Amino acid sequence: NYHSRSESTVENFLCRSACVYYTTYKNHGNFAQWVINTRQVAQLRRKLEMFTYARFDLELTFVITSSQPVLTHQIMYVPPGGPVPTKINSYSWQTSTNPSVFWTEGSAPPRISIPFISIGNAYSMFYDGWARFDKQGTYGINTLNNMGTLYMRHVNDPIVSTVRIYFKPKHVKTWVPRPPRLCQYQKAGNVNFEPSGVTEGRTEITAM
Amino acid sequence: RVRSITLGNSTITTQECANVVVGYGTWPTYLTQPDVATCRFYTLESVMWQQSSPGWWWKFPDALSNMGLFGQNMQYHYLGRAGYTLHVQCNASKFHQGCLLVVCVPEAEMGCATIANKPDQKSLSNGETANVFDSQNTSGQTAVQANVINAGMGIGVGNLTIFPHQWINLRTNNSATIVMPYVNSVPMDNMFRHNNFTLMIIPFAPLSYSTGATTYVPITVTVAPMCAEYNG
Amino acid sequence: RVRSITLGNSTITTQECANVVVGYGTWPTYLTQPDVATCRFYTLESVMWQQSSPGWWWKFPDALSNMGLFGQNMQYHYLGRAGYTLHVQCNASKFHQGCLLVVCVPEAEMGCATIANKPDQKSLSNGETANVFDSQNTSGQTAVQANVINAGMGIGVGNLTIFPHQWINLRTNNSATIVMPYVNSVPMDNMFRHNNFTLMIIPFAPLSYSTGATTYVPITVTVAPMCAEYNG
Amino acid sequence: RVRSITLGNSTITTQECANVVVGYGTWPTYLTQPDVATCRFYTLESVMWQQSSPGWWWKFPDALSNMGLFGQNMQYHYLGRAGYTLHVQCNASKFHQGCLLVVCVPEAEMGCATIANKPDQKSLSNGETANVFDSQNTSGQTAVQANVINAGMGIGVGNLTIFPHQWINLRTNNSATIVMPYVNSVPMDNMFRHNNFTLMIIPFAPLSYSTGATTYVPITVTVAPMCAEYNG
Amino acid sequence: DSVVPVNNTEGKVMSIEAYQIPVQSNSTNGSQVFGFPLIPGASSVLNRTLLGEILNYYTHWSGSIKLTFMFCGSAMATGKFLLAYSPPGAGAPTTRKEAMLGTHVIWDVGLQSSCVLCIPWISAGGYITCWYQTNIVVPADTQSDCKILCFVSACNDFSVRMLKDTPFI
């Protein structure tokens, strides 16, 4: 379908798995969380930022291991606008509109697909504007880029768990190409940079 | 020869042979409450190009926000949409040399001089008054990191050619025309909290002239909105 | 390109694209003893246009009165008639600026500097030598009131455009051509006591130039009589 | 039944069976720069009809002079022209009685209370606020001689029926509609120094009511301009 | 068309300079170059023109007017002027921006040596202004400034209604 094509095509460039998040949670004390983002990893961020707008589906695979019965883990997805837990036993863990995956160790890793879910017609990589005009802290925040949040807990009634989240964009469409970033990244929430030289230096302008 | 163009109650002239760049190969069209009373040319105050000028920029929905009826339609509506034709011209003699890049950049989100902060509204845009790029790293708490080499975006300035643009080389041409389509993630938006694109004019070859010549070159920017739409 | 025109044994060149003014929409025709031996170009001594020049004039039947055969045909006849083509050209560079009105005025009867008197023959005309307008009120008992603003006639100089004329704006053209028909109250007249028309050249925009440029511009007047007629 | 009429962004209702008077048998037509953005209904503040009310009047170009866009088009133009539809309605019960004359009077030039003087601008018109007729002879240096019996004009009030009008007899109807054509000595005029017509509402039979009834009757005037024209 | 004495200031009326509008290469950008009332009653810059003289023989007249502006700088001179028209009752503009938002033409002397406007004129009376959108750029120093000449004539369907004595005798 898509793979038997040039590696220069947009889908082959972007539809590659990456580990985007590494965390831990314990069975005593208590849960892990990650807000889905595309600015989390510099290599991924750089490739996506070569475009201004993008539309894609998300594939999420979870590699879960643990250290000191069958151990069951719950992975919960909260869509934009859904309730979130604050506690290991918050009511939000049982919400019917917050999909969960129940999985046990020894089976193949958990996997879910999240479709394009923005209200707008594309996710914006850049936003020359404000969520609120008079609030300077909102410059660059596009509220249409909320991809939802993941939560993880151990299901039971001195165990330590570790989670690796693998992310892969699929069926990716992009618009309006941009120059690749020259500067190193400073923060995930900004486009701030340290002014940087256009290239490496030479000792003379001539061929030798 | 010379082509006279009239829109509304305003007239400008261009060279009949001048080239027109149409961004992304797309002409503006309608999708709403149309308004053609604002489809006139708005000429912005000219800027002077000197030997040492680092460059200029304008945010568009904001650049025209005080311009009579256009400014009023932004003020009386919740949502809106528009495309623009931008005419950029230089007044120079055959004894002047230099070269400008005239480029329109969608979503030109800019970085702050202070890494921990975000730039403020005036450092990003001074409305119809051009903002100026710096040759040096800028400094301030809300200041834009306007150093020219990174175009305020953290990219190399030589790669801005990816965006709709035209070069002005004074030995061959003194003008550029860019047709800029509406580009966004949504069909219509709030025109006060979002700048669809930024117009940047950056010298790549410094202005220079013969010894008895005028020491500066005026650069004039004329803007003509198209297919404006607003909520009912 | 360039058009070469030969009349008799004389040749001149003009720009192929130059415009020709035909006074009153009329070309000269015959009504008499014709004479075509005089149908040649007569080039008058050039005058120099300086930054401060007030203007020049010529009375026509008189301007050519010493010109070989034309002058002789006036002298050997009682009555006569003629039309004229007048070619006026400037030699100037692209670094010169200024603007002249070249006008032919029928019956340009002139006023005297002294109200009680009439002007004399030489103050009115110096033959082939140009007479000069003044920037100041003139004075003398037989002097012509040559102050430029009244064109020597007591009218405003800006209204001379009522008469056949052409403007020479050095940024666009350096020449004028006027075809002047015979105009009178009678079919033929004594050519020594009556001047059918006066040619006036009046700057409306002073000559100016770049600092290394020639400080004057030559103005050359070439005259070609047509359809000359005399009594038998 | 009930007829709903929408003009622009305003809607009013009238009785489907209500009668319409067209002044002089003429409908407004265009002759200019048309403007239909003002072709909406403007409802004036209601006046209260009491047992002792003497009557009310409005000068028209002036009555709408503060009304948004209509007022602005008067202010931004030198000359203009317009016709009007005037809707007058009363809110009364079957236990109320009385009778009004609703009349439009062209060129209703009014007399002054002081014979030696002329009336001032505010005594003649209070803009959208109704002026009031008096039952007594008025007095003042610039005051209008508003005594009702002479309609402010020195004529008998019972003869105002010569002008376009409709009677409102509360036992049969509570409304009037008058279409008033443009009437003048010239095609277009200055709309600030000339009142094309005056609307007068004069009771001929006093308001009266049963003892438990509301002691006043609201009278509402709604105005709809037609075929407005202005200079370019 | 006849030449209009636009620069008819007290010390210019007795000179040919009355017809010469000055243009300076070092002017403040956005400043006014020239302007005048199109007042029909004693139009000071238009009542001694061929047009003005004829209209002064009638008590009433109406029609359209053609105004031509001609730039007389050097061939290599370039720059832009803003020619603005203010309708009767509008008032003259005070700034270049105010003029720009009204009725106007941008005249680039590097493309056209002249520009022609057509306005109504009857009998405040409306105004003509010209602003320095940019200065004038030249390849070399000159010893003097640049001039603009103005011309006026009846444009079309011009009519007059009642013969009277001229006021100029």
Tab-separated table of C-alpha atoms in Angstrom, chain B:
chain	number	residue	atom	x	y	z
B	1	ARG	CA	4.211	49.869	-21.054
B	2	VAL	CA	2.333	50.995	-17.790
B	3	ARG	CA	-0.783	49.371	-16.400
B	4	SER	CA	-3.267	51.416	-14.361
B	5	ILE	CA	-5.263	49.429	-11.820
B	6	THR	CA	-8.332	50.799	-10.052
B	7	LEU	CA	-10.039	49.235	-7.052
B	8	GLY	CA	-12.837	51.093	-5.376
B	9	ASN	CA	-11.786	54.721	-5.249
B	10	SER	CA	-8.026	54.063	-5.342
B	11	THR	CA	-5.630	53.746	-8.292
B	12	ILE	CA	-2.060	52.458	-8.564
B	13	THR	CA	0.319	51.808	-11.418
B	14	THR	CA	2.562	48.878	-12.136
B	15	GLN	CA	4.819	47.929	-15.030
B	16	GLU	CA	2.767	46.038	-17.600
B	17	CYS	CA	5.477	43.368	-17.805
B	18	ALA	CA	5.874	42.797	-14.040
B	19	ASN	CA	5.771	39.166	-12.821
B	20	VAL	CA	3.193	37.875	-10.357
B	21	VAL	CA	3.756	35.126	-7.843
B	22	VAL	CA	0.712	33.161	-6.778
B	23	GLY	CA	1.368	31.454	-3.502
B	24	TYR	CA	0.920	27.702	-3.509
B	25	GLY	CA	-0.573	27.942	-7.030
B	26	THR	CA	-3.876	29.036	-5.470
B	27	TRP	CA	-6.086	32.043	-6.139
B	28	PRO	CA	-8.437	33.269	-3.338
B	29	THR	CA	-12.104	32.251	-3.680
B	30	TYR	CA	-15.241	32.545	-1.495
B	31	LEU	CA	-16.435	29.536	0.702
B	32	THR	CA	-20.909	33.813	4.925
B	33	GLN	CA	-21.441	37.628	4.587
B	34	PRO	CA	-19.208	39.015	1.788
B	35	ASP	CA	-18.009	42.603	1.795
B	36	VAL	CA	-16.460	44.262	-1.250
B	37	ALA	CA	-16.561	47.839	0.089
B	38	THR	CA	-13.066	47.256	1.445
B	39	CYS	CA	-11.672	45.939	-1.824
B	40	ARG	CA	-9.438	48.918	-2.430
B	41	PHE	CA	-5.709	49.426	-2.259
B	42	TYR	CA	-4.207	50.374	1.082
B	43	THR	CA	-0.779	51.881	0.827
B	44	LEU	CA	1.347	51.575	3.928
B	45	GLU	CA	3.881	54.180	4.933
B	46	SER	CA	7.099	53.686	2.947
B	47	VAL	CA	10.275	52.557	4.664
B	48	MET	CA	13.722	53.770	3.775
B	49	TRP	CA	16.369	51.295	2.694
B	50	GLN	CA	19.806	52.344	3.804
B	51	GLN	CA	23.255	50.744	3.432
B	52	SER	CA	22.911	49.180	6.867
B	53	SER	CA	19.215	48.271	6.976
B	54	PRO	CA	18.638	44.726	8.447
B	55	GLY	CA	15.074	44.261	7.097
B	56	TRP	CA	11.391	44.875	7.895
B	57	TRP	CA	8.211	42.921	8.668
B	58	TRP	CA	4.417	43.239	8.906
B	59	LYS	CA	1.744	40.903	10.355
B	60	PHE	CA	-1.129	41.107	7.965
B	61	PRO	CA	-4.570	40.973	9.590
B	62	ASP	CA	-2.998	43.373	12.094
B	63	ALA	CA	-1.277	45.655	9.515
B	64	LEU	CA	-4.650	46.642	8.116
B	65	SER	CA	-6.516	46.757	11.483
B	66	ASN	CA	-6.671	50.560	11.585
B	67	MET	CA	-7.407	50.994	7.903
B	68	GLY	CA	-10.835	52.523	7.789
B	69	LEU	CA	-13.496	50.052	6.697
B	70	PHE	CA	-11.223	47.017	6.780
B	71	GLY	CA	-10.442	47.743	10.406
B	72	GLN	CA	-14.139	48.248	11.110
B	73	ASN	CA	-15.169	44.954	9.557
B	74	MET	CA	-12.700	43.192	11.780
B	75	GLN	CA	-14.197	45.073	14.796
B	76	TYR	CA	-17.846	44.368	13.977
B	77	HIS	CA	-17.511	40.645	13.325
B	78	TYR	CA	-16.784	37.490	15.293
B	79	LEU	CA	-15.203	35.412	12.518
B	80	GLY	CA	-13.712	36.271	9.156
B	81	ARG	CA	-11.578	35.242	6.182
B	82	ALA	CA	-9.562	37.070	3.471
B	83	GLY	CA	-6.871	36.625	0.777
B	84	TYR	CA	-4.459	39.428	-0.187
B	85	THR	CA	-2.516	40.844	-3.098
B	86	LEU	CA	0.691	42.488	-2.007
B	87	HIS	CA	2.537	44.919	-4.227
B	88	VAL	CA	6.063	45.858	-3.220
B	89	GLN	CA	7.984	48.522	-5.120
B	90	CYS	CA	11.360	50.287	-4.887
B	91	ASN	CA	12.272	53.752	-6.129
B	92	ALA	CA	15.886	53.588	-7.276
B	93	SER	CA	18.137	54.783	-10.100
B	94	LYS	CA	20.470	52.888	-12.450
B	95	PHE	CA	23.289	54.044	-10.196
B	96	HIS	CA	21.905	52.047	-7.247
B	97	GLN	CA	22.584	48.390	-6.478
B	98	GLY	CA	21.259	45.893	-3.957
B	99	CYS	CA	18.941	42.930	-3.567
B	100	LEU	CA	15.872	42.144	-1.436
B	101	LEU	CA	13.945	39.006	-0.621
B	102	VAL	CA	10.231	39.677	-0.407
B	103	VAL	CA	8.542	36.716	1.297
B	104	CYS	CA	5.152	35.831	2.820
B	105	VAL	CA	5.410	33.420	5.736
B	106	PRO	CA	2.260	31.569	7.046
B	107	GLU	CA	2.021	31.135	10.810
B	108	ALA	CA	5.301	32.949	11.459
B	109	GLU	CA	5.349	32.265	15.144
B	110	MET	CA	8.320	34.153	16.586
B	111	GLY	CA	10.736	33.362	19.396
B	112	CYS	CA	11.492	35.620	22.397
B	113	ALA	CA	14.860	37.228	23.164
B	114	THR	CA	14.535	35.821	26.696
B	115	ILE	CA	14.229	32.041	26.462
B	116	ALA	CA	12.083	31.740	29.558
B	117	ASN	CA	9.458	34.211	28.277
B	118	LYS	CA	7.083	34.826	25.389
B	119	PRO	CA	7.215	37.964	23.189
B	120	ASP	CA	4.587	40.638	23.674
B	121	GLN	CA	1.993	41.982	21.282
B	122	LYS	CA	3.875	45.111	20.219
B	123	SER	CA	7.253	43.500	19.799
B	124	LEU	CA	5.561	41.013	17.445
B	125	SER	CA	3.530	43.696	15.602
B	126	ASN	CA	3.352	47.475	15.496
B	127	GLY	CA	0.277	47.385	13.204
B	128	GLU	CA	0.712	49.388	10.021
B	129	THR	CA	4.176	50.444	11.208
B	130	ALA	CA	6.930	48.093	10.096
B	131	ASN	CA	8.809	46.084	12.642
B	132	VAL	CA	12.550	45.929	12.167
B	133	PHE	CA	14.942	42.963	12.127
B	134	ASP	CA	18.233	43.328	13.974
B	135	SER	CA	21.794	42.573	12.839
B	136	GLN	CA	22.660	41.770	16.456
B	137	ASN	CA	21.118	39.406	18.944
B	138	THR	CA	18.295	41.317	20.583
B	139	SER	CA	17.633	41.515	24.292
B	140	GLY	CA	14.659	42.174	26.533
B	141	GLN	CA	12.016	40.315	28.538
B	142	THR	CA	9.273	40.536	25.926
B	143	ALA	CA	11.425	41.414	22.946
B	144	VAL	CA	11.355	39.346	19.778
B	145	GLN	CA	14.573	37.644	18.858
B	146	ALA	CA	14.772	39.636	15.696
B	147	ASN	CA	18.325	38.796	14.675
B	148	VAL	CA	18.095	38.603	10.858
B	149	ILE	CA	20.025	35.424	10.368
B	150	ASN	CA	17.302	33.388	12.014
B	151	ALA	CA	14.325	35.401	10.615
B	152	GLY	CA	12.898	35.521	14.146
B	153	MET	CA	11.980	31.832	13.793
B	154	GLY	CA	15.148	29.826	14.554
B	155	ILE	CA	15.698	28.782	10.922
B	156	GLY	CA	18.379	29.835	8.483
B	157	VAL	CA	17.275	32.983	6.629
B	158	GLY	CA	18.555	31.603	3.297
B	159	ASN	CA	15.850	28.897	3.417
B	160	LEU	CA	12.858	31.299	3.467
B	161	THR	CA	12.548	30.666	-0.251
B	162	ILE	CA	10.379	27.676	0.671
B	163	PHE	CA	7.560	30.224	1.278
B	164	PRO	CA	5.902	32.343	-1.547
B	165	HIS	CA	8.418	34.950	-2.533
B	166	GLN	CA	10.001	37.084	-5.144
B	167	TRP	CA	13.504	38.530	-5.416
B	168	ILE	CA	14.109	42.178	-6.184
B	169	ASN	CA	17.491	42.733	-7.792
B	170	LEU	CA	17.766	46.399	-8.528
B	171	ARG	CA	19.771	45.851	-11.725
B	172	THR	CA	16.793	43.900	-13.238
B	173	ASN	CA	13.601	44.771	-11.361
B	174	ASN	CA	12.301	47.099	-8.710
B	175	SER	CA	9.147	45.276	-7.839
B	176	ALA	CA	7.376	42.181	-6.630
B	177	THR	CA	3.763	41.053	-6.595
B	178	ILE	CA	2.511	38.260	-4.387
B	179	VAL	CA	-0.959	36.782	-4.307
B	180	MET	CA	-1.446	35.209	-0.920
B	181	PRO	CA	-4.393	32.696	-0.553
B	182	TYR	CA	-6.161	32.103	2.704
B	183	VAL	CA	-4.240	29.451	4.599
B	184	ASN	CA	-5.392	27.981	7.907
B	185	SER	CA	-6.433	24.831	9.788
B	186	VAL	CA	-10.039	26.108	9.904
B	187	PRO	CA	-12.396	27.794	7.305
B	188	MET	CA	-12.770	31.054	9.322
B	189	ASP	CA	-11.142	32.542	12.398
B	190	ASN	CA	-10.958	35.414	14.934
B	191	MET	CA	-8.963	38.075	13.044
B	192	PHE	CA	-7.681	39.822	16.165
B	193	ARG	CA	-5.891	36.980	17.928
B	194	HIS	CA	-4.351	35.294	14.919
B	195	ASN	CA	-2.010	36.469	12.169
B	196	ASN	CA	-2.453	34.342	9.098
B	197	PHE	CA	0.902	35.398	7.625
B	198	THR	CA	3.855	37.746	7.944
B	199	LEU	CA	5.397	39.795	5.166
B	200	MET	CA	9.145	40.039	5.447
B	201	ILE	CA	11.496	42.179	3.398
B	202	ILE	CA	15.125	41.197	3.903
B	203	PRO	CA	18.174	42.615	2.046
B	204	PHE	CA	20.652	39.922	0.911
B	205	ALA	CA	22.853	42.378	-0.916
B	206	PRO	CA	23.311	45.798	0.858
B	207	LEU	CA	22.129	48.981	-0.706
B	208	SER	CA	24.931	50.778	-2.402
B	209	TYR	CA	25.203	53.686	-4.723
B	210	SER	CA	27.426	56.014	-6.703
B	211	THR	CA	28.858	58.919	-4.759
B	212	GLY	CA	26.445	61.655	-5.899
B	213	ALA	CA	23.331	59.468	-5.620
B	214	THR	CA	20.497	59.548	-3.111
B	215	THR	CA	21.627	57.661	0.005
B	216	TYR	CA	18.409	55.738	0.514
B	217	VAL	CA	15.792	53.841	-1.448
B	218	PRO	CA	12.091	54.081	-0.525
B	219	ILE	CA	10.230	50.782	-0.354
B	220	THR	CA	6.462	50.985	-0.687
B	221	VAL	CA	3.988	48.294	0.254
B	222	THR	CA	0.440	48.318	-1.167
B	223	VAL	CA	-2.167	45.849	0.001
B	224	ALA	CA	-5.393	44.786	-1.711
B	225	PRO	CA	-7.744	42.330	0.156
B	226	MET	CA	-9.796	39.842	-1.911
B	227	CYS	CA	-12.892	37.734	-1.309
B	228	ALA	CA	-13.400	39.018	2.210
B	229	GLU	CA	-15.955	37.037	4.246
B	230	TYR	CA	-17.482	37.551	7.659
B	231	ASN	CA	-20.047	35.846	9.881
B	232	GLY	CA	-23.634	37.073	9.444
